[PDB]
């Protein structure tokens, strides 16, 4: 055994750079802006980023933890 989890860390960047209409698109889809890899030059997260975050979040890697499968 003696198995451990890689771990988790945080990087500066409290204030997010993205339009207001887009900032909400996340709060509605429970999307972590910070996680949403912005596209705009200045890492500005555009509306497209959101639609691109779900397509990736939906097909994530997760265990069976039961009969359920999706």
UniProtKB/Swiss-Prot annotation:
Phosphoserine, modified sites: 65
Segments forming domain Peripheral subunit-binding (PSBD): 17-54
Entry-annotated residues carrying N6-acetyllysine: 41, 47
Compartments it resides in: Mitochondrion matrix
Quaternary state and interactors: Forms a 24-polypeptide structural core with octahedral symmetry that represents the E2 component of the branched-chain alpha-ketoacid dehydrogenase (BCKDH) complex. The BCKDH complex is composed of three major building blocks E1, E2 and E3. It is organized around E2, a 24-meric cubic core composed of DBT, to which are associated 6 to 12 copies of E1, and approximately 6 copies of the dehydrogenase E3, a DLD dimer.
Disease note: Patients with primary biliary cirrhosis (PBC) show autoantibodies against the E2 component of branched-chain alpha-keto acid dehydrogenase complex. PBC is a chronic, progressive cholestatic liver disease characterized by the presence of antimitochondrial autoantibodies in patients serum. It manifests with inflammatory obliteration of intra-hepatic bile duct, leading to liver cell damage and cirrhosis. Maple syrup urine disease 2: A form of maple syrup urine disease, an autosomal recessive metabolic disorder due to an enzyme defect in the catabolic pathway of the branched-chain amino acids leucine, isoleucine, and valine. Accumulation of these 3 amino acids and their corresponding keto acids leads to encephalopathy and progressive neurodegeneration. Clinical features include mental and physical retardation, feeding problems, and a maple syrup odor to the urine. The keto acids of the branched-chain amino acids are present in the urine.
Name of the protein in question: Lipoamide acyltransferase component of branched-chain alpha-keto acid dehydrogenase complex, mitochondrial
Gene that this polypeptide is encoded by: DBT
First-to-last residue of the parent protein present: 163 to 220 of 482
